[PDB]
Amino acid sequence: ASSQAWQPGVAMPNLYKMQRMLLEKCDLQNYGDSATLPKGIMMNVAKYTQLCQYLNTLTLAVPYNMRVIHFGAGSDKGVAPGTAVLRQWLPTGTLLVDSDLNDFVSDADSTLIGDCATVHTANKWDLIISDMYDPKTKNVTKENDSKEGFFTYICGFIQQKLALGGSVAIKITEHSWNADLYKLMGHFAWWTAFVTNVNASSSEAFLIGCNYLGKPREQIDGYVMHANYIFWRNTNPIQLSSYSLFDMSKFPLKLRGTAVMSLKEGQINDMILSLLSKGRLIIRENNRVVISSDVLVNN
Amino acid sequence: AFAVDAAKAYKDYLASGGQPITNCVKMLCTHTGTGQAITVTPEANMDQESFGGASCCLYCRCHIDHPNPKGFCDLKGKYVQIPTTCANDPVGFTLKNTVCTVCGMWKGYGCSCDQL
Ligand SMILES: C[S@@+](CC[C@H](N)C(=O)[O-])C[C@H]1O[C@@H](n2cnc3c(N)ncnc32)[C@H](O)[C@@H]1O
Ligand SMILES: OC[C@@]1(O)OC[C@@H](O)[C@@H](O)[C@@H]1O
Numbered sequence: 001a002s003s004q005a006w007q008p009g010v011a012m013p014n015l016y017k018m019q020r021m022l023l024e025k026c027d028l029q030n031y032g033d034s035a036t037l038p039k040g041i042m043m044n045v046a047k048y049t050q051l052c053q054y055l056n057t058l059t060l061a062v063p064y065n066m067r068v069i070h071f072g073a074g075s076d077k078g079v080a081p082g083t084a085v086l087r088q089w090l091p092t093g094t095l096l097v098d099s100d101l102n103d104f105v106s107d108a109d110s111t112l113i114g115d116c117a118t119v120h121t122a123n124k125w126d127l128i129i130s131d132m133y134d135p136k137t138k139n140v141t142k143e144n145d146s147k148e149g150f151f152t153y154i155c156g157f158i159q160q161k162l163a164l165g166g167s168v169a170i171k172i173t174e175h176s177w178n179a180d181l182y183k184l185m186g187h188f189a190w191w192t193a194f195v196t197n198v199n200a201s202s203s204e205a206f207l208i209g210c211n212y213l214g215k216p217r218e219q220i221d222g223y224v225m226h227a228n229y230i231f232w233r234n235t236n237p238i239q240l241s242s243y244s245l246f247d248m249s250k251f252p253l254k255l256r257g258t259a260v261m262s263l264k265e266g267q268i269n270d271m272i273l274s275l276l277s278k279g280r281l282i283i284r285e286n287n288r289v290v291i292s293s294d295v296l297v298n299n
Numbered sequence: 300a301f302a303v304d305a306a307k308a309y310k311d312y313l314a315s316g317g318q319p320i321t322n323c324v325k326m327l328c329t330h331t332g333t334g335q336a337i338t339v340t341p342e343a344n345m346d347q348e349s350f351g352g353a354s355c356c357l358y359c360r361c362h363i364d365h366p367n368p369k370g371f372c373d374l375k376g377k378y379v380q381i382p383t384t385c386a387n388d389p390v391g392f393t394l395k396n397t398v399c400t401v402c403g404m405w406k407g408y409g410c411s412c413d414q415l
């Protein structure tokens with residue numbers, strides 16, 4: 001019925017980002033309702049499909065031998081539905097690495113098992129996807145404060161290992177969020193909080209940073225922006241919808257062969273920032289991709 | 300000389316009325332694909348379902364060595380097309396069936412090389 005029902009999901013409207021709301025409890029009118037999924041399709045296949053359908057509408061840089069890392073790729077099922085969707089979406093030749101605290105079987109080129117804080121990489125990445133989440137973070141009996149844990153790692157990983165021009169999609173919820181991560185959204189040419197139509201009855205959203213500039217283009221107060229996010233969700237019921245899942249004809253991410261250059265910080269002028277902001281440039285070394293997981297030895 | 304035979308163990312389990320391995324990852328796709336057995340992207344035709352390869356591999360799923368030198372996996376990182384009528388047990392279908400080395404279709408479920 002709703003025009004938004006034919007889209008893969010709904011992005012936080014710009015006017016909501018410009019407010020200065022106080023943090024309230026998230027109370028979704030459509031809470032408890034579940035979307036009707038195509039027969040035999042898992043919620044996370046539907047969710048990642050809608051996230052990728054939305055990312056197709058942005059100015060993502062898509063170089064040859066694109067580097068994608070996926071955190072929180074495991075599941076209680078012991079398989080990686082989201083990684084299978086990313087492998088389907090990304091151009092052939094894209095290097096896909098995934099990771100989770102718990103063991104799982106994956107379609108990724110390489111999988112690292114352990115706390116994300118143990119994951120180290122010699123190379124920079126073009127796209128970071130995180131579905132990391134702990135359902136125990138949802139505590140309505142205590143103040144909803146900015147969370148650390150894996151968010152501390154993701155903030156440092158973006159600032160140290162994301163290529164300029166690169167993008168991120170980081171899963172958050174009413175209670176699983178970080179003020180510094182919202183602040184870092186101001187270091188991208190554009191950002192939003194995206195809600196998949198199949199999971200519209202959840203406070204879940206993907207914080208998307210599009211085209212990393214490596215410096216703040218706008219100053220964002222993370223506590224205020226999460227309050228703005230909840231205010232938007234509380235006042236804009238989103239109709240549950242699986243409609244976009246039935247047309248996969250234009251699903252694959254187009255290989256744009258985006259230029260990759262190794263420029264120093266002193267060579268990043270306004271002309272380079274313009275190319276980065278349009279998804280026409282990636283700045284990072286193009287050396288071999290090397291990853292590792294630190295192992296604590298004890299007895 | 301001893302070697303765990305997971306393939307035989309699963310076939311015997313199904314024969315005894317055992318419930319097929321669950322959580323094989325079914326993909327959304329056009330269902331207008333080539334219909335080949337194992338592909339780089341989902342290639343299900345109107346008579347098939349496409350699944351993430353690793354989730355349909357007995358060896359990957361049971362955390363056991365792949366039966367061949369170097370322990371290479373033909374499914375991990377790929378998509379397996381399963382006839383819709385057999386999609387209730389993708390692991391069993393991949394174990395009990397063979398891919399034609401000429402056309403890439405499942406023998407008995409797409410391969411027409413033996414026709415006149
Ligand atoms: C919602 S589940 C992910 C579902 C998965 N994306 C899929 O495709 O089905 C969240 C995952 O985050 C992982 N996780 C939570 N905290 C983590 C941490 N500190 N380091 C690594 N993984 C973590 C959990 O082990 C869990 O598998
Ligand atoms: O398409 C318009 C725009 O404002 O919204 C989508 C993002 O990819 C932005 O970079 C872009 O400039």
Ligand SMILES: OC[C@@]1(O)OC[C@@H](O)[C@@H](O)[C@@H]1O
Pocket residue numbers: 040042320321322323324325386387388389
């Ligand atoms: O593994 C086969 C399957 O049909 O088993 C039941 C559910 O786990 C489905 O997602 C899965 O595809």
Ligand SMILES: O=S([O-])[O-]
Pocket residue numbers: 003006
């Ligand atoms: O909104 S149109 O796609 O039905």
Ligand SMILES: [Zn+2]
Pocket residue numbers: 353356357358359360365372373374375
């Ligand atoms: Zn395998």
Ligand SMILES: [Zn+2]
Pocket residue numbers: 399400401402403404410411412
């Ligand atoms: Zn044949």
